[PDB]
Design a protein around this ligand. Sequence first.
Ligand SMILES: Nc1ncnc2c1ncn2[C@@H]1O[C@H](COP(=O)(O)OP(=O)(O)OP(=O)(O)O)[C@@H](O)[C@H]1O
Ligand SMILES: Nc1ncnc2c1ncn2[C@@H]1O[C@H](COP(=O)(O)OP(=O)(O)O)[C@@H](O)[C@H]1O
Lengths: 209, 529
Amino acid sequence: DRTPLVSVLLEGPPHSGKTALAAKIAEESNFPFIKICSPDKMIGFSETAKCQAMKKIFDDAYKSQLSCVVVDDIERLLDYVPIGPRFSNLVLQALLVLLKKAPPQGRKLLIIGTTSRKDVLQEMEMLNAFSTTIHVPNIATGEQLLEALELLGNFKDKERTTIAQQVKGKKVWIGIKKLLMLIEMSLQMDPEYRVRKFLALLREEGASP
Amino acid sequence: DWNFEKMGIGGLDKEFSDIFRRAFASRVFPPEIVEQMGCKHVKGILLYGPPGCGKTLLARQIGKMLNAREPKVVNGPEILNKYVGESEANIRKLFADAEEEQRRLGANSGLHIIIFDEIDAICKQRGSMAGSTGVHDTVVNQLLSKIDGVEQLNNILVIGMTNRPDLIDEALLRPGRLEVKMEIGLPDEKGRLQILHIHTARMRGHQLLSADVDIKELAVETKNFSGAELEGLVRAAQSTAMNRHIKASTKVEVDMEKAESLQVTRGDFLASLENDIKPAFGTNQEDYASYIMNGIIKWGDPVTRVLDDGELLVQQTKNSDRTPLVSVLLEGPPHSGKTALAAKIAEESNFPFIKICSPDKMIGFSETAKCQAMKKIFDDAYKSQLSCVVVDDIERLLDYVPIGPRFSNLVLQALLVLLKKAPPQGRKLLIIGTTSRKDVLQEMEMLNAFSTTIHVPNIATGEQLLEALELLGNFKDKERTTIAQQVKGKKVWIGIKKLLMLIEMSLQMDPEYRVRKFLALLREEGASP
Ligand SMILES: Nc1ncnc2c1ncn2[C@@H]1O[C@H](COP(=O)(O)OP(=O)(O)OP(=O)(O)O)[C@@H](O)[C@H]1O
Ligand SMILES: Nc1ncnc2c1ncn2[C@@H]1O[C@H](COP(=O)(O)OP(=O)(O)O)[C@@H](O)[C@H]1O
């Protein structure tokens, strides 16, 4: 009752799977009113239109005894691009004002964010508004890679052994979505050369943490 | 009576049954039980889909089915007038007969039908902010007041048709107003079969069609036709058959009975298919001739490598379930001929819907117009079971110039967003980009959105240039030997288009002095990366 408004930021490396986890949390919330404010439904909008859309979503969110709103891929809303830099000021000011506005008496709210560039948000003095942050990591060991390959269920036992013998000798750094894409790309060759191409792609993609 | 087929509509099996069940189930049941229950009647429905797929026809047929009076067709753009209180007056004139007849006859009145066409051009979301009210904030208010107001009308039905179902107000779609929504999409094989039967029943009856015409074949041939396209095909075929009959009669003194025997039509169908009808949601054969103009000549292994990689990507995007969206980027030095290979891959794709987006058609356009054009192209691409879209130059769409640097941010955001949006369930897409400056793209952080990259190199050996000259076949044997001896050294660096231009320029001198000019031009050019 002393904290009617809460916030949280989910951040990590790209191709790591943030939106899915945010949606899963929202679904498991069991709240009467759940919404998503994504940037792919505002293609071509100017600044003021985006401001109006965000305000309209939050106005509706303010008319229920409970709520939950997800703002995902913030850096797309702000219109950021490293050259310059350049971005939109009106949207940033609107978001900063809305992140600390209390609903009418007796009602409650919860906001979840998402991003892939934490430092750039830190430079704008934004992390002073979010109450806390959570970190989503990538795959960082051969055992986890083999476990994921098993759970997906693509390769046989002999191929599992062949890949393990070579891949258990060091550490790896790869996201989950990229892993699915690599598997799908590998499966287009003839049955003989599948594992070789998979290993070649994995070696090429591998980079220092 | 339902008999969807008898009425004159084919391919609408479920989008008719659901309508009949949900909306019209309380108009035909015995009045006694309906009155005993005490349930009102639905007050309208909404139809949205691609143009030319048979919406207005369904509205008129529904109107005729219920013994309703003559519908009042209205066009959305025509209601607006520039004086105060003229648009509202027009919107308020359509509901006169219903009010008068209910006031007179009590509760035994008939049924009136009103058809709004392009309902999204007068009814847009109202502006909440003070001082930011729209210009058409009164038409919507008048329409909302009339549809369901203080005085009830229980003898009306409003049918609205549109194409952009997401711009319409949200107070106009609650269960009281226009509470049923339906989608009419492009017909599949069975729908085309039914439509062709409906449109050739008359010719079959009058005994004019040949015995060698097979409707199933023509059903398979047309892949993304709508109804209007099929009807136009039939009419064009019959017209060309008439023209052939007249030509045969005039050319020769043959008996008229022979001409009437020739009145049967077999080749007309294929001729019209290949030369008369141009689908909007189908492959276009007129553009590849304008991009791959001089053809693909195999001068080395790199061409084979690139084509094989493209084929692999296509085969992946066809037969996958975990990746409905795939992207690829062709990058290389200038004048290497990237657009030609991209178009060749697209042509060899064998996909129902192929389109090319290039900046040549956007001269003088402001950035917002370019955004709208790209959005429309992708929106069209989202309506087919398979697709392929080509973005020609990703460096002129941005208006990049090294000084500054200066470019347009909004188009870049549109591109970055549109490379991640997946199509509706079950449909698949493929995107091929073509660029000449990959480093600047990497600076903008666009190179991480793509999936894979392909490299298109230049000629880098003497024997490759000699083989290219052989394939082009311009110079004779002695000049061939002279050139081969001169540049046997493998330190050449030239683009294919530049090679064509140099050959054309060098050919303009007299027969004696032709090799020297070509060699001088080649030497003047660069010789290393
Ligand atoms: N193997 C080949 N690869 C590419 N183009 C070829 C080949 N053989 C012949 N050509 C011809 O070369 C020309 C290719 O020019 P194209 O328009 O693709 O250039 P480009 O690389 O897009 O140019 P720029 O980057 O300067 O805009 C076409 O006439 C094509 O017919
Ligand atoms: N399902 C169908 N079966 C047969 N013909 C159709 C069908 N749908 C459309 N047509 C043809 O298309 C023509 C025009 O359709 P139209 O009413 O203009 O559609 P829209 O509402 O998209 O403008 C009609 O005259 C009709 O012959």
